[PDB]
Ligand binder design. Sequence first.
Ligand SMILES: [Cl-]
Lengths: 90, 90, 90
Amino acid sequence: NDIQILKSSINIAIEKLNDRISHDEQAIRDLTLEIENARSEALLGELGIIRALLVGNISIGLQESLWELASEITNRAGDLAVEVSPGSWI
Amino acid sequence: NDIQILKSSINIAIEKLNDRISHDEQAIRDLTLEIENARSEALLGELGIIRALLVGNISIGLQESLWELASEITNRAGDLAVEVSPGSWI
Amino acid sequence: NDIQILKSSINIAIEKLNDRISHDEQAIRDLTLEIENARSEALLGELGIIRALLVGNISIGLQESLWELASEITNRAGDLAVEVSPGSWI
Ligand SMILES: [Cl-]
């Protein structure tokens, strides 16, 4: 009798909970996408500036520090799927 | 008898769970705030550098690449509520 | 009789749920680590560019705007445990 009504009501309550958790897991999955994207933007923004200076008539020492700096920055960025713009040397 | 004691104890246990989930949802909400802020900082940091170069005596080609670069960066930043500093052209 | 079988089955179901939540909490903890790291990278990338310009033969006004800019950027970065490279002024 009352055991079975209770069992089914448990099951609904747990379902709702799993709904809540799953909804948090998908948001934790969006955020981790948002973090990757933030990193990708900063990465492209910083290389974008470096390459703008590199393609100009800048002194030879600043070219050394900027190339080196491009690697360090690029090293810190573990590995995201970057796609730096075509470039523009001529 | 023992059905009712069991029902109330279920209800407490579920409450605690919903407490845990709600506490995760508020942290997922802080992080999404933290991500926006990280993006805003990188955005302001990169425009800050670009505008420092733009207001100086830099070559005319570097000015072209930097203005263009300011848009691309600003385009990648979907739309955050930016507030770039007043500027400083004179 | 059937009350006790039901009680134990509740306990397993709740355990599984707490497992799920705890697994979300550790991921919310990784993301908050990932956000800090994204901020640290952008921070180092932007100071890296600024210091490359600062150590060169740049005009005196651009040096003013860049030093100032280094503080504003560094101020916006609440306080992360930064570790800017040794520097390189000579
Ligand atoms: Cl220059």
